[PDB]
Design a protein around this ligand. Structure first.
Ligand SMILES: [Co+2]
Ligand SMILES: [Co+2]
Lengths: 360, 360
């Protein structure tokens, strides 16, 4: 297990969503969870989102995966960047657990880059928070003040060593490149914008035929011009909208289903044949471990728990919270909730969806 | 011009969106704007939304237009119902002008039914207000209390004579059928529901890349379980949404474009060759009349005027208001605004869209 040496209160108070920083020796005696070869082979796979970025003579070249070969790259000036490696590699997923001092719903996935000397993606600006973890090799990283971007004056210019972490808030322009063959591990975050929220909620309202109440004007106001639309009427309409949004169970159900979805593809492999509830029970009681699929988002809002868009209900709150906060579970986590066939059938549904599995 | 004998304050106070009523002699010496033959021929056309409804032996039959023939109907138990006849027939459009005591944005279109004895659409419930105008022939109309619906006890059971009007609020079950060959003219209304508003506004926000502001949590709150989503966070998200909705120029621009669109197809026929602004000027100054396309919705919200989804701006408020409230215009309606080439070009755009034309 990876263990952060960070002062969390300090970080949250001084840096989180405020200011970038290099966390020297963030991880001690850092051992890379994955090797560049394993990463390359991973990028060879079709389900995987990867890209190769290279620069030569002031011009750039981006190529998307999956790659059949890696023959012609050169020894300098290129980088393989692979999205959501935590979806395809467990030891990599281990890198994210130290950062659970920040909320799960905000945490995104883990992107891994390998870069040869000079390799990088050039000067750019992101929109989400990120922790860039230095593995093997060395990288020069530069971050400027809050404004692909034009060259900037750097307020940070450091050479990262294994175990160093570079935190960057959204909006801060940054550029990093390899000095030696290097592995970087971006623990990325995610935050919805208002547009995404409004369109998502609108979809939710459409699909479920909510908000079927019609504008009603028994006290229809007079006007000079019959073509006019009066401010009171505009206000009434707006308040219809605001009222639907403020409805207490609709909004957070929608948000539960929406936020629990991943930005990147999961390794969904439904077991065949499917599991009966009895099977789940037996396996758990026999001491077997139930493992959450890597990257599968399980978030808790109110009484309900949401997994990959699915809403989960159960009178058994402690066990459901166990589902929410344990990536590996055992029978004692569920407790007496295992004696409820409804709960077992719920778990069996989750397993048959491939969201959770036993052992591997 | 048709002239209503209704006491409008009385109606608005006692009936509008409250209670149905028969307005005896609503129109005096009522002359039908269209004949059943003209209506049939109209339904023969492809651009027209019409349907033939018939009942026989306790079973019904609905057939959609356009119809190539009308050979086999019978002499009883059927009705032709044609949508938005005001889009295709000017004297019919004249029937709607008396009802401009109610706001334009709420007024819908005009549906005309012809029915032989026994002809009707059976017992049903609508969702919008309506004024049903009795033309030639007789119809028995029944309306029950606020609950295709099951048979009801009627609080109104009247036989309409030419010039009679039956007002029915949304939700009141009604059934009407011909006693003699009859023409009915439904001045229908329209009101958006919350769902339509939220999805429309969401579309508007998507298309125009609004609401690009991301959720920001520098003061990210602590939790017992990292999988939890806290109420403060839900509130923050909700308030992002409410804030975007409350933005003063975005909402009413969207609503302007949205509400000014018709529920039924218009007769859009762009003139060829297009009009130059000089042409518009000349025609107006020569005394020619500029006529709004039948059914074309022109509504005014704030300084802006909206036509069929298009937003129209002009420093010349009186003339724009003229565009808003006059279905037939002359040069004196526009005044000095005609000496502005920008305004002329605006009018020329409107004409070239086929939204307005000269004379016919
Ligand atoms: Co970046
Ligand atoms: Co009706």
């Amino acid at each position: 297990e990876y263990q952060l040496t960070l002062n969390w209160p300090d970080f949250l108070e001084r840096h989180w969503q405020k200011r970038p920083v290099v966390l020297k020796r963030g991880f001690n005696n850092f051992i890379d969870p994955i090797s560049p070869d394993e990463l390359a082979g991973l990028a060879m796979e079709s389900e995987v989102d990867s890209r190769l970025v290279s620069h030569q003579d002031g011009k750039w070249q981006v190529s998307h995966g999956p790659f059949e070969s890696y023959d012609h790259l050169g020894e300098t000036n290129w980088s393989l960047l692979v999205q959501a490696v935590n979806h395809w590699h467990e030891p990599t997923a281990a890198l994210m657990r130290p950062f659970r001092e920040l909320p799960d719903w905000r945490i995104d996935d883990l992107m891994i880059s390998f870069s040869v000397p000079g390799g990088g993606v050039g000067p750019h600006l992101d929109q989400y928070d990120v922790f860039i973890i230095q593995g093997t090799g060395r990288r020069r990283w530069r971050v400027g003040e809050k404004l692909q971007v034009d060259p900037f004056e750097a307020i940070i210019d450091e050479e990262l060593e294994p175990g160093d972490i570079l935190y960057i808030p959204p909006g801060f322009p940054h550029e990093g490149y390899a000095l030696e063959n290097a592995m970087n591990y971006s623990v990325g975050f995610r935050a919805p914008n208002t547009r995404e929220l409004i369109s998502g909620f609108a979809d939710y309202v459409l699909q479920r035929e909510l908000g079927g109440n019609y504008y009603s004007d028994p006290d229809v106001p007079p006007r000079a011009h019959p073509a006019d639309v009066l401010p009171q009427e505009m206000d009434k309409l707006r308040e219809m909208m605001l009222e639907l949004i403020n409805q207490p169970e609709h909004f957070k159900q929608w948000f539960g289903e929406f936020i629990s979805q991943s930005r990147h593809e999961l390794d969904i492999a439904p077991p065949e044949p499917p599991y009966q509830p009895d099977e789940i029970y037996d396996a758990l009681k026999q001491g077997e471990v139930l493992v959450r699929l890597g990257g599968l988002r399980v978030l808790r809002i109110g009484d309900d728990v949401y997994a990959n868009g699915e809403k989960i209900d159960s009178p058994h709150r402690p066990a459901l919270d166990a589902l929410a906060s344990n990536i590996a579970l055992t029978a004692e986590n569920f407790g007496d909730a295992l004696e409820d066939p409804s709960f077992l059938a719920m778990l069996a549904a989750l397993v048959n969806s491939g969201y959770w599995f036993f052992e591997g």
